[PDB]
């Protein structure tokens with residue numbers, strides 16, 4: 008599994024604990040888990056940075072008298088969302104993952120959907136890169152940006168739970 | 179080595195591997211050897227910590243004077259929680275310097291425990307063979323050769339006892355600190371901890 | 372061999388009752404120590420309890436009547452007539468300490484493997500005779516006369532006579548334990564033993580605490596009493 | 600083992616195997632059917648034993664009957680039929696009782712001590728409610744729980760089987776009786792027979808300790 | 815194990831009720847004997863000092879430290895009270911000489927008692943005049959056994975003195991001070 012995607016940077020194939028050398032047949036599940044984590048992390052990092060200088064106009068509920076511009080930046084912004092809005096967000100995520108972008112087949116654990124690639128959701132109406140060098144570069148860029156976004160989103164979460172902002176002190 | 183041929187097992191959890199999270203079979207042998215070394219160091223540190231916390235909570239201080247002007251009982255007047263901070267700065271410096279030297283010397287030895295050594299077998303003389311450094315031949319483990327009258331089977335049985343006691347000591351020292359921090363968490367630990 | 376000997380001794384103690392073990396302590400491995408050692412410990416402890424109870428009954432009679440030695444000794448501090456629970460209440464504290472120490476020395480000699488192997492004997496748990504006392508013949512400095520037979524008039528006894536003596540010893544020991552705790556129970560709670568009502572006065576101190584109501588600290592030693 | 604449930608005829612004729620809520624198959628935690636009914640048998644026997652002991656303890660606590668030299672006799676001498684004198688006990692003693700029960704069950708259900716005795720787990724082909732003896736870590740420990748004096752060291756298999764059937768039946772009836780007592784203590788409901796005038800533990804019977812312990 | 819030390823008053827056998835052997839090797843038994851011998855000799859010196867000073871003795875004639883105001887007779891007759899009256903320079907000198915002597919004893923015997931050797935045979939500080947330079951090997955074992963017995967008795971002696979000083983009326987022959 009040393010020649011697969013993600014083993015491109017200065018470290019080559021970097022598996023210290025050896026998850027995929029102990030179980031080489033478990034690489035596809037780990038790749039799907041990493042790809043979902045990376046995509047959620049890119050969305051989270053972009054939301055963290057963009058909510059600081061961009062805010063929607065108008066109200067959020069028009070019943071709890073809560074504005075888009077009144078939610079501060081972060082965890083407290085998710086606090087001030089009304090319970091119906093939280094229910095709708097969870098319904099959107101559940102419908103988005105259980106049926107539309109389905110990362111897992113199988114009864115309980117979820118292997119990989121058929122003979123597709125790990126993280127090969129959406130389908131049909133999605134850009135399919137030909138020219139395998141370009142496809143390999145695009146996929147490796149996706150994976151590496153996902154990993155960097157995981158670390159960044161974790162750091163901003165660590166900052167937000169001990170401050171009022173995700174910006175570290177001194178910045 | 180593999181987690182199957184390892185001295186943890188124990189008779190309490192049915193005589194098999196306790197691992198309910200599947201950690202032992204999800205990683206390679208090098209990670210398991212690192213985990214065994216970390217568990218053994220944790221257990222020994224926790225045994226020392228549990229005995230020291232019990233002694234400091236019973237207010238059993240040394241007879242004499244810690245620093246010139248500072249009594250052992252003056253530091254141990256409060257509980258073990260407010261005790262390390264009452265130590266003079268030079269004494270904490272010397273203790274942590276000796277611990278630093280011990281860790282560096284035991285890690286800089288021939289066959290590392292992840293590269294051919296035995297995880298948890300600390301070398302008897304960590305400060306021997308270092309160029310420009312002379313230390314007496316006091317052994318780190320057993321300065322008195324207590325485990326020289328022991329056979330291989332007795333050594334294996336006492337290694338099993340060491341592992342079980344280290345696990346119990348980790349639970350106990352975390353129990354002591356949590357019982358001080360969160361009163362009423364541990365029913366036996368009354369006030370002076 | 373263990374339980375068979377136990378049945379035989381119980382049958383000789385009483386043909387009617389025979390083996391009476393309702394608790395079944397003769398089947399319990401007391402320290403994971405087989406059957407032989409457990410029954411040896413049980414027989415040795417029963418014999419020791421019976422001997423101590425017989426001696427205690429005689430001593431209780433002697434102190435309740437008033438039977439002092441004479442002068443100078445620890446009897447001089449004990450008042451003339453205080454009942455037997457209170458004569459271990461007025462002797463000096465060091466007298467009680469030295470008495471208990473000498474009893475412990477006797478127990479240790481009765482258990483020390485040098486003394487037992489001197490006169491060809493093993494431990495009662497390891498396969499020796501329960502209740503046997505090795506004579507003295509290892510104690511560095513020589514001892515004048517033994518403890519079981521001080522004047523040695525029982526050296527001509529047949530083994531059958533010795534067995535009947537052991538059976539009588541055990542029966543008398545059991546009955547003396549019962550009598551002595553009749554005395555001790557009447558000294559604590561009234562109306563327990565109907566026969567002993569009004570004879571034995573009540574006692575307030577604890578019987579199971581040796582130095583409770585500890586005695587005084589007096590020096591009865593004269594001539595060169597540098598320990599004032 | 601599904602047809603091994605024909606022992607309910609021996610427990611009581613006429614009313615044979617009676618399972619309306621058909622728990623006979625109902626795979627628990629993905630285990631097999633025989634393991635599920637082994638769990639059911641062991642849980643039933645444990646509930647019956649605890650119910651019988653709780654019934655006797657209920658009678659004792661209602662009729663006072665305290666220890667002679669116990670210094671934890673500071674509880675009130677009147678006392679609710681039972682749940683207040685449990686509540687009047689200090690919390691450390693209740694915790695020690697609960698930890699004792701947990702230690703003894705963990706001893707009962709360890710497969711090392713069970714197979715050393717010669718008998719497997721109750722969901723792996725073993726008799727439910729066995730409780731093996733003490734091959735403990737260095738601890739002589741005289742007297743196991745079951746027949747410590749040895750009242751049934753020798754016994755025919757017919758007598759043991761009859762005792763097992765009697766144990767299950769008396770356990771069921773003691774579950775019914777003990778919850779009749781607890782019902783007459785709280786929102787009476789057992790006006791038939793009135794159960795013999797039990798005051799009323801206004802509180803919850805299912806509320807151990809005086810403090811909530813945030814759990 | 816076999817060693818020296820045993821003799822009469824025990825039956826010609828080893829004395830250890832609590833075990834404290836059968837967990838000991840040759841190295842551990844050598845440490846046991848070295849610690850026993852050092853404790854024994856220190857205790858013999860300690861009883862010979864406390865007994866001489868407290869009971870009687872002419873005491874050392876002179877002054878003890880010409881500058882500070884102390885006299886040999888001004889130290890007193892008590893053991894612990896006179897030790898505190900010894901000046902700090904004298905205490906540090908005694909402790910430093912003892913430490914230098916023992917560090918050189920550890921670094922001077924090349925078959926170390928924990929690595930061979932004979933326990934209790936420290937270099938120097940024994941007979942400078944060679945009183946035992948002609949003694950037979952059989953007689954020397956008797957003297958070593960006598961040293962061990964007298965040392966154990968002296969250990970009990972120093973602890974009796976310490977107990978009598980700290981908790982009064984213990985050790986009944988020793989007085990209240």
Ligand code: CLA
Pocket residue numbers: 181182184185186187188191194195196197201202210213214216217220345346348349352
């Ligand atoms: C951090 C300390 C530490 C470490 C490094 C280990 C490491 C190990 N243990 Mg171990 N153990 C510990 C603490 C630890 N243990 C404690 C405290 C107990 C008592 C409950 C046990 C009880 C125990 C048993 C009974 C067995 C092992 C076994 C093993 C080995 C295989 C399991 C494995 O791969 O897990 C790798 C482990 C880790 C990578 C550590 C993960 C630590 C997580 C992050 C902490 C989670 C704790 C959580 C907060 C709950 C804490 C509450 C608690 C205080 C009550 C491995 C060498 C098995 C063995 O030796 O078989 C050969 C075995 O049978 N352990």
Ligand code: CLA
Pocket residue numbers: 223225226227228229230231233234238239240241244249250251253254261262265
């Ligand atoms: C995690 C380990 C640990 C830590 C961090 C501490 C920390 C502390 N201890 Mg402590 N202690 C420990 C374990 C520990 N102890 C153990 C295991 C014991 C039982 C022996 C004690 C007994 C103890 C006493 C009696 C006293 C302290 C005191 C103190 C405080 C002052 C520092 C000091 O002089 O320590 C000294 C600590 C030790 C000497 C413990 C020995 C630790 C080493 C690693 C073991 C050496 C092995 C060997 C058996 C030692 C004997 C050598 C032999 C040649 C005689 C400090 C808060 C003092 C206090 O209350 O505050 C002033 C004090 O009077 N400790």
Ligand code: CLA
Pocket residue numbers: 377380381382384388389390391392394395396397413414416417420545546548549
């Ligand atoms: C501490 C004293 C003591 C000891 C160690 C023994 C020991 C023994 N007796 Mg024994 N016995 C004693 C006193 C003692 N006896 C007394 C006082 C009597 C007269 C009542 C008897 C009458 C007797 C008979 C008739 C027989 C034995 C036999 C035996 C042997 C086997 C039975 C057994 O397991 O122990 C016996 C059981 C115990 C010692 C139980 C221990 C005491 C418990 C734990 C405390 C109970 C206290 C409680 C207040 C008592 C309430 C009494 C009442 C309400 C029932 C064993 C060597 C058998 C034999 O002959 O073998 C040679 C036998 O058949 N005993």
Ligand code: CLA
Pocket residue numbers: 649652653655656657659660664665666669671672674684685688
């Ligand atoms: C199984 C349920 C149960 C529970 C939760 C309790 C709970 C309690 N009992 Mg209790 N008890 C029970 C059953 C129970 N009992 C039974 C069945 C009996 C009759 C033997 C008693 C007889 C009893 C007495 C005489 C006293 C208590 C007391 C108490 C309270 C203090 C704890 C204590 O010392 O317990 C001690 C209770 C036991 C050791 C009995 C439990 C052991 C098993 C289940 C039954 C006995 C087995 C066997 C016959 C043992 C021989 C007798 C032996 C106890 C010496 C506590 C509220 C004390 C109290 O009221 O304090 C305020 C008190 O004085 N109990």
Ligand SMILES: CCCCCC(=O)OC\C(C=C=C1C(C)(C)C[C@H](OC(C)=O)C[C@@]1(C)O)=C/C=C/C(C)=C/C=C/C=C(C)/C=C/C=C(\C)C(=O)C[C@@]12O[C@]1(C)C[C@@H](O)CC2(C)C
Pocket residue numbers: 048049050052053132133134152153155156158159160162163174175178
């Ligand atoms: C219709 C919905 C489409 C959704 C998908 C989408 O929109 O994807 C768009 C997309 C590409 C694409 C496309 C496809 C996806 C291939 C297909 C699409 O066409 C269709 C519909 O098929 C269009 C197309 C071509 O565009 C790519 C999006 C990529 C995205 C959003 C990547 C975020 C990285 C963030 C990082 C690396 C953060 C690092 C954070 C780091 C390194 C930190 O440490 C943070 C830091 O704070 C810390 C902790 C402390 C501070 O002091 C300092 C800083 C601030 C540094």
Ligand SMILES: CCCCCC(=O)OC\C(C=C=C1C(C)(C)C[C@H](OC(C)=O)C[C@@]1(C)O)=C/C=C/C(C)=C/C=C/C=C(C)/C=C/C=C(\C)C(=O)C[C@@]12O[C@]1(C)C[C@@H](O)CC2(C)C
Pocket residue numbers: 419422423426442443444445470473474477478481502504591592593594
């Ligand atoms: C100068 C040489 C003599 C000195 C003597 C001495 O100094 O004091 C002596 C003294 C008083 C005195 C003094 C005088 C003598 C009157 C005069 C002197 O006046 C001066 C000089 O000034 C000193 C003074 C005041 O002290 C009083 C001595 C009193 C004494 C000797 C009291 C023994 C009790 C035995 C008991 C209680 C038995 C328990 C029961 C026992 C031991 C057992 O049941 C043992 C046993 O169960 C075991 C363990 C296992 C079983 O298998 C076997 C048996 C069943 C057997």
Ligand SMILES: CC(=O)O[C@H]1CC(C)(C)C(=C=C/C(C)=C/C=C/C(C)=C/C=C/C=C(C)/C=C/C=C(\C)C(=O)C[C@@]23O[C@]2(C)C[C@@H](O)CC3(C)C)[C@](C)(O)C1
Pocket residue numbers: 186187188189190191196341342343345346349813814
């Ligand atoms: C085979 C081998 O060699 O191993 C040996 C080693 C060893 C150690 C001796 C063994 C053992 C046995 C022992 C002694 C095991 C000890 C176990 C022990 C003593 C475990 C304490 C847990 C305390 C907890 C979890 C506290 C939780 C606390 C929680 C969850 C909370 O925060 C409470 C709360 O959250 C709730 C619940 C709801 C919330 O709304 C409110 C809050 C936040 C307040 C073995 C395994 O038998 C054999």
Ligand SMILES: CC(=O)O[C@H]1CC(C)(C)C(=C=C/C(C)=C/C=C/C(C)=C/C=C/C=C(C)/C=C/C=C(\C)C(=O)C[C@@]23O[C@]2(C)C[C@@H](O)CC3(C)C)[C@](C)(O)C1
Pocket residue numbers: 425426428429525536543544546547549550551553554564565566567
């Ligand atoms: C409720 C009620 O009404 O009941 C009443 C009844 C009653 C009776 C009034 C009560 C009582 C008190 C009781 C029961 C007292 C019992 C006392 C008892 C049973 C006391 C044993 C002494 C044995 C001795 C001294 C052994 C000597 C042993 C000797 C001298 C020897 O060893 C020597 C010897 O053996 C050799 C070595 C071998 C052989 O050559 C034979 C001889 C002898 C030469 C109670 C308590 O109030 C209860």
Ligand SMILES: CC(=O)O[C@H]1CC(C)(C)C(=C=C/C(C)=C/C=C/C(C)=C/C=C/C=C(C)/C=C/C=C(\C)C(=O)C[C@@]23O[C@]2(C)C[C@@H](O)CC3(C)C)[C@](C)(O)C1
Pocket residue numbers: 651652654655750751762769772773775776777779780789791792793794
């Ligand atoms: C309207 C109506 O219906 O009535 C009302 C009112 C009323 C009547 C009050 C009610 C009630 C309450 C009731 C009926 C409660 C019943 C409680 C019940 C039936 C409680 C069993 C305890 C069993 C024990 C303790 C067993 C000990 C067993 C022991 C001690 C053994 O060792 C057994 C032993 O076998 C061994 C192991 C070995 C053998 O060799 C020897 C023996 C045999 C000795 C109702 C029914 O709820 C409702």
Ligand code: KC2
Pocket residue numbers: 421422423425426500501502503504505518519532533534535536537539540541543544
């Ligand atoms: C105060 C304590 C005490 C009392 C009150 C007491 C009472 C009686 C009675 C009257 C009821 C009889 C009839 C009797 C008889 C025998 N006693 Mg006892 N005896 C006491 C002490 C000892 C001691 C210390 C020993 C001993 C023994 C024997 C033997 C020898 C058996 C044999 O050699 O086979 C016989 C026949 C020795 C022995 O070995 O017992 C295993 C032994 O060591 N006895 N003993």
